[PDB]
Design an enzyme around this catalytic site. Sequence first.
Site, PDB file in Angstrom:
ATOM      1  N   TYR A  83       0.759  -1.261   0.000  1.00 50.33           N
ATOM      2  CA  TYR A  83       0.000   0.000   0.000  1.00 50.33           C
ATOM      3  C   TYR A  83       0.794   1.318   0.000  1.00 50.33           C
ATOM      4  O   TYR A  83       0.750   2.042  -0.989  1.00 50.33           O
ATOM      5  CB  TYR A  83      -0.944  -0.004   1.232  1.00 50.33           C
ATOM      6  N   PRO A 107     -11.247  -0.300  -0.824  1.00 43.64           N
ATOM      7  CA  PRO A 107     -12.440  -1.092  -1.111  1.00 43.64           C
ATOM      8  C   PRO A 107     -13.666  -0.467  -0.459  1.00 43.64           C
ATOM      9  O   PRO A 107     -13.556   0.405   0.413  1.00 43.64           O
ATOM     10  CB  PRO A 107     -12.097  -2.457  -0.519  1.00 43.64           C
ATOM     11  N   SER A 166     -10.397 -12.194  -3.886  1.00 38.41           N
ATOM     12  CA  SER A 166     -10.536 -12.395  -2.452  1.00 38.41           C
ATOM     13  C   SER A 166     -11.959 -12.782  -2.087  1.00 38.41           C
ATOM     14  O   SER A 166     -12.919 -12.396  -2.756  1.00 38.41           O
ATOM     15  CB  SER A 166     -10.173 -11.120  -1.686  1.00 38.41           C
ATOM     16  N   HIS A 191      -7.519   0.826   2.834  1.00 37.62           N
ATOM     17  CA  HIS A 191      -6.949  -0.510   2.996  1.00 37.62           C
ATOM     18  C   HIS A 191      -5.733  -0.738   3.891  1.00 37.62           C
ATOM     19  O   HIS A 191      -5.635  -1.769   4.562  1.00 37.62           O
ATOM     20  CB  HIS A 191      -6.561  -1.020   1.639  1.00 37.62           C
TER      21      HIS A 191
END
Length: 589
Positions: A75, A88, A523, A310
């Site tokens: 990240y 997300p 995921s 995230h």
Amino acid sequence: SGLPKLPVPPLQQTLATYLQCMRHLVSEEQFRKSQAIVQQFGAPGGLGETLQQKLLERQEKTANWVSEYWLNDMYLNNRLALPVNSSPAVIFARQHFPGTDDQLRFAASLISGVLSYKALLDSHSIPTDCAKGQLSGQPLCMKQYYGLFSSYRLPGHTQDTLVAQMPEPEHVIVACCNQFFVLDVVINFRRLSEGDLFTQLRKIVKMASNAAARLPPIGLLTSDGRSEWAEARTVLVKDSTNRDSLDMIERCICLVCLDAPGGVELSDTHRALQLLHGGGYSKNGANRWYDKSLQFVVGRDGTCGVVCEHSPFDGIVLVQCTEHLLKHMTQPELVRSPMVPLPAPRRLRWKCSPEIQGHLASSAEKLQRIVKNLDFIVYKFDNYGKTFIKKQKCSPDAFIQVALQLAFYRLHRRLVPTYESASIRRFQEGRVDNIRSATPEALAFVRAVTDHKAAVPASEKLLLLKDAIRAQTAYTVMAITGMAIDNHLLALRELARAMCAALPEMFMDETYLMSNRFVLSTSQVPTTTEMFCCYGPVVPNGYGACYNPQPETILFCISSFHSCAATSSSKFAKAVEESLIDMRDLCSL
Ligand SMILES: CC(C)(COP(=O)(O)OP(=O)(O)OC[C@H]1O[C@@H](n2cnc3c(N)ncnc32)[C@H](O)[C@@H]1OP(=O)(O)O)[C@@H](O)C(=O)NCCC(=O)NCCS
């Protein structure tokens, strides 16, 4: 902590697995070169062993030898704008708000939920989680929960900074009409009543409607590239008044965004677009502040959910929190806490300049590009779910992962390095490692299914299908027990980098670089509620596939970029459907 430390897999194991993972994904010539490169890297008394020893030393000296490398590589180092690329979104069920007060009542209750949840956390009263599904029963790390409300992601020129917190008073930032207000929720451990929160929100809406007081949509700046925002922020920091407002945002518990009525229909897809990027500056795109970890959206038309940054925690922890919040909203309104005198919420002031005005224009334009480039769709497969899959003596997750490989292959005629989040919370500070679903077994299966000229007998296809699922499961078990390869190779890579900025062939190899471009990033984010999680792709020519497997259905959130003529979310969703049907027919022989 009583949890075990993240293991350091043996060097030779990771190297062997690595090569095996990539052999079918590269040319023979390139593979031969990689074989030799790896052989030299992991040879006795070679560089590989030197770095491995340093990793063991690091493992001993730290709680989790990969936390830092992972956090930066996954990240903080990423320069892309947070919206769609990184943050997300979790969408709640459609709500109905006849009048504005209905919207504000929801928001008030939600904020109360947040406060009691945070109380449970501050008192370490949250029940320690235990593994379920693959290898279940053991305690899980709970560190992520403590990053839910105490984190802020600061932009930086090359690398971002994740700031870990408590301001007293404690407050939430409420955004309305792109205006940011400070809403104190806890004086002296005194937690405002759900009745007083409603009253305060009414005031905020009122003020957020004052033309003579309307300030520039600074929030927009946080939706830009990280290097871009870091620069615009540096400009803002020059003024004392902006320095104060930023700090307030930086120390809030979270954001509560009162979104304006969306324009289009309220379908799962559209409601998700709003949560992902707000629909652009012309919609709710500036009524945000992406650096903050949690942005709860409660729109006038009933579109609600939460935008998540995230870097401080993953989707499972997030979903547990949200499901708790929503359940708390189902639970009866307690007795009152009444506040006399109830001060009016403070509007954060901004001192804009000609510079900032230019930055806002750029960000507006940059964001619009993200909005029009996102190809997103929510697809609900309803022919069957986990129940049927378990009847085939198969892991749902593995079965679904294989279905995605077949969908990808039947559409594009090739397999590509694929990523699947595998939780390693079994270990201290554990985040996730990678399950590489594009296995050799998957290739043999997808080829048998799609190569008509081969005329592979259905009975054989079934065998290849079961073997593909067996291999998926094996890798899954390998990853969740910390025996996979991605985190391991990352550590070795950064340890070497510390020795000399010139990385070893091993990591300069086109095979290694290619292995990390996840054209299919996925995921599983299961939920009992009606909610769902979604996110964009991680490469220009790739897809984002987040699924929620239920007993009789499987929700698929597919994303891609309209810029890549090769990808198409509608076509991919269709391929997923056909793949699931095909697999079902195969198991029904
Ligand atoms: C890797 C991972 C996805 C595997 O998921 P999982 O939950 O074990 O899923 P499975 O498909 O194996 O399904 C487990 C269920 O199927 C069952 N099952 C598994 N294998 C089976 C088999 N061969 N036959 C019959 N049933 C089986 C399990 O017993 C379990 O049933 P339960 O509902 O009664 O508990 C999971 O370990 C993980 O890491 N999840 C986290 C994802 C994440 O981090 N998301 C956020 C990313 S930011």
